[PDB]
Design a protein around this ligand. Sequence first.
Ligand SMILES: CCNc1ncnc2c1ncn2[C@@H]1O[C@H](/C=C/CNC(=O)c2cc(-c3ccc(F)cc3)cc(O)c2O)[C@@H](O)[C@H]1O
Ligand SMILES: [Cl-]
Ligand SMILES: [Cl-]
Ligand SMILES: [Mg+2]
Length: 213
Amino acid sequence: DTKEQRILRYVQQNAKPGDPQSVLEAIDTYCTQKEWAMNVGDAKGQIMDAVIREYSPSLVLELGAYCGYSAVRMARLLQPGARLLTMEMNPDYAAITQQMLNFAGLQDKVTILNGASQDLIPQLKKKYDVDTLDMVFLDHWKDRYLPDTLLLEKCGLLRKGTVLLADNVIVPGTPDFLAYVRGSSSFECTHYSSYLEYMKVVDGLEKAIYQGP
Ligand SMILES: CCNc1ncnc2c1ncn2[C@@H]1O[C@H](/C=C/CNC(=O)c2cc(-c3ccc(F)cc3)cc(O)c2O)[C@@H](O)[C@H]1O
Ligand SMILES: [Cl-]
Ligand SMILES: [Cl-]
Ligand SMILES: [Mg+2]
């Protein structure tokens, strides 16, 4: 029995079916009162909410679903017709994410893609009929933010005004990612200082808006 299974079970027993906000609240309560887990959390979540509301993206890609917290958080704020694609390499977590989305009633807005980002990203145009992405949320292995950003560019999946939003740029940190988006004339960057999920360690998100090549 895993921590991730316990979190799902807690949501299933306590949250309100088909109520995404109640699902987020139940996850936050579990992590506040029981076991910590690497969800973006409430504090950084408020920033994520503001970005989704501001830019109203039609197609979002999330890298790293884990238990589905960020998928629920983003999908609940998408406009009618808008869609989220979330990539997750670990099939146990992909199964948990699907059950979370099902409970939240968000399953028709979200598609879980099984596998590693480096293998799925190059298939998005052909296999999954994507032209370009409006937003990308990065929250997977921290040394893969830079390589995947470069792969997204190479594959032609970013357009002028595509918003990249990256978690954990301070803790654990994504220093190479930051040096790249901040140094590159291809991105205009904003830093959002906040706190690591479920504690008071300073962490932040970076918003990097693609400008074209
Ligand atoms: C191989 C790269 N491509 C990938 N493609 C698809 N899914 C991927 C990928 N990498 C990782 N994943 C999945 O993303 C998730 C992993 C995320 C990594 N997150 C962290 O390490 C993380 C870690 C912390 C943290 C912070 C402070 C600490 F003291 C200890 C840990 C905080 C966070 O908010 C984090 O996001 C898992 O579900 C994993 O299976
Ligand atoms: Cl929090
Ligand atoms: Cl736009
Ligand atoms: Mg994170």
